[PDB]
Amino acid sequence: SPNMLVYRKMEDVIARMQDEKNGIPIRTVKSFLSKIPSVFSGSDIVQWLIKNLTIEDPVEALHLGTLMAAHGYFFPISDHVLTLKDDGTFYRFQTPYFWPSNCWEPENTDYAVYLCKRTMQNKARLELADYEAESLARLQRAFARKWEFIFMQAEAQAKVDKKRDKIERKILDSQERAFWDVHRPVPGCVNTTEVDIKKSSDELQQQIKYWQIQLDRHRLKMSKVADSLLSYTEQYLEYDPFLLPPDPSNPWLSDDTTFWELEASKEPSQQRVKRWGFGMDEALKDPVGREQFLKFLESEFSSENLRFWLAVEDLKKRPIKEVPSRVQEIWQEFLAPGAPSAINLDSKSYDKTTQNVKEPGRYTFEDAQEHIYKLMKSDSYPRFIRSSAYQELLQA
């Protein structure tokens, strides 16, 4: 179960927190009104975080502390809503029987028990806040039968704990107050219990063959990948609109629209034209690049292979209703010998084509597309980038 590991890590945290030799010291304050022992101030825990965790931002360490304290690992002695506030207020750890890691789950009758007990310990005031008084009103109206032993065991517990010493009753009641704060919190702050429903739950011959495919699994050195990754970063590094934007106009930040609108304009910018020059794949991604490359191929009387590859791609878009209607037709137009558009195949290519053409398939012309595609990538794109039209358009 996932969150179990999370709670385990934070358990590591608090275990290092109340360390014998290091740790925060749980002090005993003396006041003009009273003498309160076994507390400490939130500035202490803030300092402890910053020391032993090296959390550079005070705010960051404070937010870590915030959610920790909203998972019941320490609470403010005079408040319902768990929030760590860096100041002189008094805190306390929680008990190993009342962590939240212990799969606990209170229920409505037990909330009624704690309500009767708190309301009946003191009888000097309605020692409570308006939300908890509201909850008790509902519990009354709906629990008409079962009240009595609730009251019974409540005052029983009151005697069984008051019989022990006066500071004991105080600390135990403080703890077993806060632990019900965290498991039924004030209307505002988020519950920290819930979870998402998603987590709501020959033999050696194939073995040996896996070993052999790992052998023939061609790999390259990490330095090679390093160069590839750095270089693919660099070639658009000057295009990153987060780090160093080529144009600081940001429709988000600087309330402009012109950047995208220039992007909509079919006329390519000089960034655009320099960016075409990296790879014809990116070109074909560009509609503008498709148009200009196709123009050159036409004016050079060489506008067929691109026509084919566009044909393959535009075929790979329609549903299964038209796959046969196109495959036979595209064969008869390009891959049927005797048609004007003469795609050119070798032995195994045309063999594969002839065998598959009976059956229209989502991966029909893979090897032929590879063949013509390596052809175009090897020949066309180079001369295009080398071409006068490319140079004249990249100049301005």
């Binding site: 109340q18 749980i26 076994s38 306390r92 750890f93 008990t95 190993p96 029987y97 009342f98 009767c116 309301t119 009946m120 009888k123 000097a124 005031r125 309605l126 409570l128 806040a129 308006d130 008084a133 509201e134 008790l136 009103a137 009354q140 039968r145 079962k146 009595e148 032993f149 009251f151 019974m152 065991q153 029983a156 517990q157 005697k159 069984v160 704990d161 600390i171 135990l172 703890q175 077993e176």
Partner: protein, 577 residues
């Protein structure tokens, strides 16, 4: 005013001579001499009014006794030509050389042999009447009251006398002469408004609210006094103008008072009345709308209680429009505190019921708290507050009602008046109680913050609570700094605020919406044995509950018991593994 009525027959520049100095009065005169108003004087010319009067009186009577023993002397050769003339002249001259009131005089006898002696400047102008006729008719100084001179026009003198006895010769003694002198009492200050004296009365000062003040100035004339009016402004004759109210010390008979609006207060009252009426009619509504969804969720009588109580809490602001007195501030505190508890208190306790029904219901629906329970934990509070009011109300009504203190009482802004009710430490403690009470309510509406409940009443209630606490703190703090800077208006603003605010609020919020070791081995074994003991204890309690949980069916109990036993034995055998 017989005097002015008497001297209303003045002859020539009389008050110009009698109220004013008689210079032009004597420079403007055409008559005979010696106008004696003898006896018209207050009393007569037979009284005692002055030191120099009694000086001359002593001179008078001692001359008289001297004569009555001297003219009765022996060896009375009567050498009226040899040297007895030296004796007589030395006598009459030296007397005014000794006496101070020395204008003119005579001694005319034959015992006319007249030493008619008048101190011209320092030489007694000596030379040789009806008064003599009267002496012959009748011993005593025949003195008149104020008589003028004889300038051959009235007389160029003010007050003066005519005091005269006889040089009675001597088979007994007999009147044979007339010694006399006319001293001018024109140099004698006088008092119209006197108690006793020359025309001692009060001319035009009604002394019911006037006070004369006779004085000493120039001397013998009318106007020789000063009147005052008493406790009122002199209408200006000087005559009292008691202030607009009893604001004493009447400089100008003007007000001390910030007199205050009509077209504020009319609308205040009409408005507040309409809100009171809304409350009443809400009560009538729910009396008609006794069937619903939520009135059963929130009991009828609680709501009538609330609404009534707060209706009553609207009294502070019909109160003040009437004048402050004893009765006012007292009823204020009655109404306030009644309203306060019987609104916010019951609300808070409703919420307490919420909490308890919750647990009650979580454990065994058996109607833990009911609407029958609320009123009891209401009456407690109602009582307490009654005893308190009786305390305060007693202190007043038995000690400081009449004896020493009061409430109807005013202070001043800069120099102007304002009355009101007022405070002491009690209202302070009152406030602090309200504060704490709702504090408890707020803790309640703090913890109770999480229920699954129908209409979220908690929102509504709890916000009324918080609102009220705030508004009350502020109100009381202001009014309990501001004892001194508060006319009626500014206050009435403040009470209007507090009341419509919290009353309307905590009517509405509730009522209206109801139509809309950190280780692994150790901790591992620890949590493990914990769960284990929990299981085994659950099992033992299950064994006891076999008959104790008689609440349901047997086979159903049978199935439950069987499943529990099976899973428990499974967990045991797993713990053993």
């Amino acid at each position: 005013l017989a005097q002015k009525l008497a001297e209303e027959v003045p002859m020539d520049v009389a008050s110009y001579l009698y109220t004013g100095d008689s210079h032009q009065l004597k420079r403007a005169n055409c008559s005979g001499r010696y106008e004696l108003a003898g006896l018209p004087g207050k009393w007569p010319a037979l009284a005692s009014a002055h030191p120099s009067l009694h000086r001359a009186l002593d001179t008078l009577t001692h001359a008289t006794n001297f004569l009555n023993v001297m003219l009765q002397s022996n060896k009375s050769r009567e050498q009226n030509l040899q040297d007895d003339l030296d004796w007589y002249q030395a006598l009459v001259w030296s007397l005014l050389e000794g006496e101070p009131s020395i204008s003119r005089a005579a001694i005319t006898f034959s015992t006319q042999v007249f030493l008619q002696a008048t101190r011209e400047e320092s030489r007694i102008l000596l030379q040789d009447p009806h008064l003599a006729n009267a002496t012959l008719e009748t011993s005593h100084f025949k003195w008149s009251p104020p008589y003028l001179e004889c300038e051959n026009g009235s007389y160029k003198p003010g007050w003066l006398v005519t005091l005269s006895s006889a040089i009675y010769g001597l088979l007994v003694p007999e009147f044979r002469g007339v010694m006399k002198v006319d001293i001018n009492l024109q140099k004698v200050d006088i008092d119209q408004c006197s108690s006793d004296g020359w025309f001692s009365g009060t001319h035009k000062c009604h002394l019911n609210n006037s006070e004369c003040m006779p004085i000493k100035g120039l001397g013998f004339v009318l106007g020789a006094y000063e009147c005052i009016c008493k406790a009122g402004f002199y209408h200006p004759a000087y005559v009292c103008l008691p202030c607009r109210e009893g604001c004493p010390f009447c400089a100008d008979d003007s007000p001390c008072f910030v007199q205050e609006d009509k077209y504020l207060r009319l609308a205040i009252i009409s408005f507040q009345a309409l809100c009171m009426l809304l409350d009443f009619v809400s009560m009538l509504v729910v009396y008609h709308f006794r069937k619903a969804k939520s009135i059963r969720a929130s009991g009828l009588i609680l709501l009538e209680t609330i609404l009534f109580g707060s209706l009553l809490l609207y009294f502070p602001v019909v109160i003040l429009y009437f004048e402050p007195s004893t009765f006012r501030c007292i009823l204020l505190r009655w109404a306030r505190l009644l309203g306060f508890a019987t609104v916010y208190g019951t609300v808070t306790l409703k919420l307490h019921r919420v909490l308890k029904v919750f647990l009650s219901r979580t454990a065994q629906r058996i109607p833990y708290m009911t609407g029958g329970r609320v009123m009891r934990m209401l009456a407690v509070i109602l009582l307490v507050v009654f005893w308190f009011l009786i305390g305060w109300t007693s202190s007043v009504c038995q000690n400081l009602e009449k004896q020493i203190s009061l409430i109807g009482q005013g202070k001043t802004s800069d120099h102007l008046i304002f009355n009101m009710c007022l405070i002491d430490r009690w209202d302070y403690m009152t406030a602090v109680a309200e504060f704490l009470f709702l504090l408890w309510g707020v803790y309640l509406c703090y913890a109770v913050r999480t229920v699954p409940s129908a209409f979220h009443e908690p929102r509504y209630m709890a916000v009324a609570v918080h609102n009220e606490l705030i508004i009350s703190a502020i109100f009381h703090t202001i009014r309990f700094v501001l004892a001194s800077r508060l006319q009626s208006d500014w206050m009435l603003m403040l009470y209007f605020a507090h009341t419509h605010l919290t009353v309307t609020v905590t009517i509405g919020l509730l009522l209206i919406p109801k139509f809309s070791a950190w280780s692994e081995h150790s901790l591992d074994p620890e949590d493990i044995r914990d769960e284990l003991k929990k299981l085994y204890a659950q099992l033992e309690i299950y064994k006891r509950k076999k008959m104790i949980t008689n609440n349901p069916h047997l086979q159903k109990k049978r199935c439950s018991k069987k499943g529990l036993g099976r899973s428990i034995m499974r967990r045991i055998t797993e713990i053993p593994e």
